[PDB]
């Protein structure tokens, strides 16, 4: 049964236990990962920000890339909070790119559906791109932003 379950595992229960956003490298360099935040913490904690991810060549960074000199330990960072949306914070030494458009470092930007962040700009052959996937399930809960106090 494991043989079928392995395949079915893809289609069956959709992933999104408490996932915020999923980072997927389209240029084929970094392995896909799942970013997540607790709803109770976000719904209970209504401050400036809830949870933020740090991405880069650093093993500490919430995201471990390959090994590109053009990228910094923590090339970019993603923050989750505000209300029911997401924000992208660039934190690279050389800069973080969005669909070819370079954004202001350590600046907050409104996330986009299936958005993509490019990094390591300088040489056409030294640029790396990343795609961000927003969890529809998560948005559903945040969209309502209402405490499920209904028995």
């Amino acid at each position: 049964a494991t043989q079928r379950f392995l395949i079915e595992k893809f289609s069956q229960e959709q992933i999104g236990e408490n996932i915020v956003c999923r980072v997927i490298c389209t240029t084929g360099q970094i392995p896909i990962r799942d970013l997540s935040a607790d709803i109770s913490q976000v719904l209970k904690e209504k401050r400036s920000i809830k949870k933020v991810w740090t991405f880069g060549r650093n093993p500490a960074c919430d995201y471990h890339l390959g090994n590109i000199s053009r990228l910094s330990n923590k090339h970019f960072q993603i923050l989750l909070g505000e209300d029911g949306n997401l924000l992208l914070n660039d934190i690279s030494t050389n800069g973080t790119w969005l669909n070819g458009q370079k954004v202001e470092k350590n600046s907050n930007q409104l996330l986009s559906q299936g958005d993509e962040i490019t990094v390591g700009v300088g040489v056409e052959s030294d640029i790396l791109s990343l795609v961000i996937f927003i969890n529809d399930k998560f948005k559903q809960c945040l969209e309502q932003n209402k405490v499920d106090r209904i028995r």
Partner: peptide, 13 residues
Amino acid sequence: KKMTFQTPTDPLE
């Protein structure tokens, strides 16, 4: 060590 640029800042010029 010479100068192991941990992360080049793009020598713009």
